[PDB]
Design a protein around this ligand. Structure first.
Ligand SMILES: Cc1cc2nc3c(=O)[nH]c(=O)nc-3n(C[C@H](O)[C@H](O)[C@H](O)COP(=O)(O)OP(=O)(O)OC[C@H]3O[C@@H](n4cnc5c(N)ncnc54)[C@H](O)[C@@H]3O)c2cc1C
Ligand SMILES: Cc1cc2nc3c(=O)[nH]c(=O)nc-3n(C[C@H](O)[C@H](O)[C@H](O)COP(=O)(O)OP(=O)(O)OC[C@H]3O[C@@H](n4cnc5c(N)ncnc54)[C@H](O)[C@@H]3O)c2cc1C
Lengths: 482, 482
């Protein structure tokens, strides 16, 4: 058996930051464990994690592909002539290009290991024996061949999460985002089940690569898609997805999925509504991946959902064992998991305890059109503050008066503490909003006030200068109002 | 002589802001004078000024149209299959749509004047007889028919700038950006003379709408284009212009232009090289437009190049005559002129002195690819502070590896005062950098430091995210580079 300072189980966004930082900057002997080295089936994620293999990186490439549907249509207004009846998308080419890109990054991570002192990769399933030794086995099965036993001082769990499935009749006929990245054919008709951002992102990808006459339906249990986002922005996004032809079936949930003779799936909705689809993708949530780790043999314990309970510095109850990223169920985004992996190495190896601030974290939804969002939604702000002011504007860019997509309203909403003037949250809908929100997030982790925003001079013509053009509140909340 | 609180000569960006404010906010009686109500020859600019009519707004529509040449080409990498030989630009469709968009905006300004009691528009050439009477004549000739003689308490001079010409033989065969907005056919071969943002932006418009086998040359008298911008960015923009096929000709200046029998124009350069072009457009400069105002008749000092000299509150030597916008030669951007108009009304009519801060003002170059810049370039900063640190990052977006456009590097450069880490300048090259620099300008107005920047968590995947990723300096200046 070998002796290590650290064993990282999971070589994703968090574990690879942590392991690399511990080995190079702190000259520690570190083992990182993951299931496989190259992206794809059987385990989908691999070296580099979910984001690089089956997450942020392939989905942004595929959403960029999807946007060309609207740009080739919108170019006509600006005088571009082409035979538009000949245009045909080519899913196969998109996936071949995407896989080339993702494998490039995988080969880069292998290089990274050859370049560094005490960092070794170990391929297999990590499971805990006791709080000081982790087993690398042949499969998730507890009775599989144990390949290696690693003796350690500190253990770091960073196994991520996995797609949540529906407990329904014919769940087995449904795919998740994982299989969606390797689909051989673009579906003609497809159902994305779920109201979250992964559902909405894929619905816009399938909508663009479908055969014309095809259809993509987005079915969600609640009233408006995208819980946790600004309610006005959720309302306008819905209509803009509908305007681009996807059918948002609100208050619909699968009940039965049955395979038809010709491979297609037949689905019975909870309303007794029925429809047939080439693909049914569940995008209903992500659960902490912790079940197989045998945490119990080391005394570390979980929450009901599988989340590993951790204090602010990422320490679990057994002290030499820490946990970061999606398995921790704090904020499930790559920059947060990376930040936590770095903070952990200052805390145990540099012995400077850094806790990661999961507050005012900005994020985006690469839907068509996209959203960039940071801080508080007004309902939450109005529960915590006395005087909340909501500022809002909407405009159709002059541009879309000429492209013909007049339904593309840019919307910006800013929530303030009206006593203070401190900007509590900024929520944007429209193109470039993911680019624009990163800088606004610096303004908010700095404590800007609405006077800071309208005293800056605008850069013209941009959509972003609206941020600097809003001075009168639309309405306020003194516990309530609207 | 009649009875006015304010007469504003020049109904443009600054001029109209001040006139609306003085009237609807402070109930003053104000006359706004301009040459023309709608865009187009002979005066090109008209009600709404240069930006609305022959500036920011027409220009930006036209460069978004030009950008379709790249994205239609780039779609192929993402699997969008189409008849590549069918694709052709129609310049007539582009300027027809641009003219309706600008005609809409002109109509709404006439609307504005109907909806506000003390505001009136007077068409003609405004000139001063005395520091309390302004006469609007029929033409710019001092001896022309006086149409109106308005008598006024205050005068606001906001006549903007005009294109600068070359005094060479055949200058009258060249156009400026004014005429380029009404060209009937896109040039097959074109020459853009100048190195500032306006010839850069038109070179990209002409490059995209040219007939195949065409060519646009950019000729500049100096060593490198975009004097006054970050030197690494200028170098990199030149190389990206060349990769998209435009021919950048440094140390090059025309000597004489003659018209060919063909109708095209023959250009002899000062090096002795010759070539023929359909269009030769001069974008060598813009000079303050004070020349026919009769400023000596009111004793107001002009600064040689034409700039009306003013103090921080935009007051001239004559205490009831103020001047704003491009005529004062301070920052020739529409936002700055508007802000100066607002500040002016506060100071004289709301009796609260303001002054525009012309520092940290961000701006954008709508080149293909675009640039977004704010603050000091390192050279200037190095001659004011003892230790300046420069941070930079370059990367090709993943997407540009899939599309053909491998040359499209995104670059961000941050200049810091190394004493406390205060960010003095951020210079970016790449798509969306105009949209990103607007909110970075807010962080800069609030006194941001490099640590504010890397302590914000990123939004992944975005280009803007690179802002939060720069911890270590590339090099420093301790008076000189190190
Ligand atoms: C489709 C999709 C889109 C997303 N898009 C974005 C986006 O645009 N921006 C963003 O910020 N976030 C996005 N996310 C979220 C982001 O991918 C994750 O939050 C982030 O990767 C979490 O990092 P992590 O370190 O917790 O784990 P991960 O990056 O998931 O890595 C965990 C690693 O552990 C390995 N592993 C699992 N169990 C074991 C075991 N027993 N033994 C060994 N190895 C094991 C896995 O194979 C995996 O490689 C997206 C996620 C998905 C699924
Ligand atoms: C092609 C081009 C592109 C530009 N793009 C941008 C951009 O993208 N973003 C940006 O911020 N800035 C841009 N600018 C600069 C911007 O157009 C100007 O800075 C801005 O319009 C200046 O405002 P102003 O109030 O000083 O006067 P202007 O807006 O120029 O208006 C001056 C007015 O005075 C009138 N006039 C002049 N003489 C007389 C007279 N004697 N009697 C009566 N009326 C008179 C003119 O018709 C005109 O309407 C661009 C400029 C050009 C030329």
């Amino acid at each position: 058996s070998r002796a290590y300072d650290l064993v990282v189980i999971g070589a994703g966004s968090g574990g690879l930051e942590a392991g690399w930082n511990a080995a190079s900057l702190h000259k520690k002997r570190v083992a990182v464990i993951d299931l496989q080295k190259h992206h794809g089936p059987p385990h989908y994620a691999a070296l580099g994690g979910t984001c690089v293999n089956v997450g942020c990186v392939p989905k942004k490439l595929m959403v960029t592909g999807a946007n060309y549907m609207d740009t080739i249509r919108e170019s006509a207004g600006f005088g571009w002539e082409l035979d538009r009846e000949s245009v045909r998308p080519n899913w196969k080419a998109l996936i071949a290009a995407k896989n080339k890109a993702v494998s490039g990054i995988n080969d880069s991570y292998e290089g990274m290991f050859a370049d560094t002192e005490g960092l070794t990769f170990h391929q297999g399933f990590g499971a805990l024996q006791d709080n000081h030794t982790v087993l690398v086995r042949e499969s998730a099965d507890p009775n599989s061949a144990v390949l290696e036993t690693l003796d350690t001082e500190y253990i770091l769990l960073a196994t991520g999460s996995w797609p949540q499935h529906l407990g329904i009749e014919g769940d087995d006929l449904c795919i998740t985002s994982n299989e969606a990245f390797y689909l051989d054919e673009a579906p003609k008709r497809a159902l994305c089940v779920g109201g979250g951002y992964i559902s909405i992102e894929f619905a816009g990808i399938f909508n663009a690569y479908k055969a014309r006459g095809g259809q993509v339906d987005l079915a969600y249990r609640g009233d408006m898609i995208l819980r946790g986002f600004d309610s006005e922005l959720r309302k306008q996004l819905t209509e803009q997805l509908r305007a681009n032809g996807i059918n948002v079936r609100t208050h619909e949930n699968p009940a039965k999925v049955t395979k038809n003779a010709d491979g297609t799936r037949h689905v019975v909705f909870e309303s007794g509504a029925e429809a047939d689809y080439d693909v049914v993708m569940l995008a209903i949530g992500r659960v902490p991946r912790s079940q197989t780790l045998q945490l119990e043999k080391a005394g570390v314990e979980v929450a009901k959902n599988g989340a590993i309970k951790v204090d602010a510095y990422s320490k679990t109850n057994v002290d030499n064992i820490y946990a970061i990223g999606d398995v921790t169920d704090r904020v499930m985004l790559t920059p947060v998991a990376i930040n936590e992996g770095a903070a952990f190495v200052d805390t145990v190896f540099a012995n400077k305890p850094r806790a990661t601030d999961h507050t005012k974290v900005a994020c985006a939804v690469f839907s068509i059109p996209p959203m960039g969002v940071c801080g508080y939604v007004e309902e939450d702000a109005a529960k915590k503050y006395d005087q909340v002011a909501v500022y809002e504007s909407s405009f159709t860019p002059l541009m879309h008066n000429i492209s013909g997509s007049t339904y593309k309203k840019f919307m910006v909403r800013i929530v303030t503490n009206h006593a203070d003037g401190e900007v509590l949250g900024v929520h944007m809908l429209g193109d470039s909003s993911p680019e624009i929100i990163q800088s606004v997030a610096i303004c908010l982790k700095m404590g800007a006030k609405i006077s800071d925003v309208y005293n800056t001079i605008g850069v013209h013509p941009t959509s972003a200068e609206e941020l600097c053009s809003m001075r009168t509140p639309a309405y306020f909340y003194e516990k309530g109002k609207r």
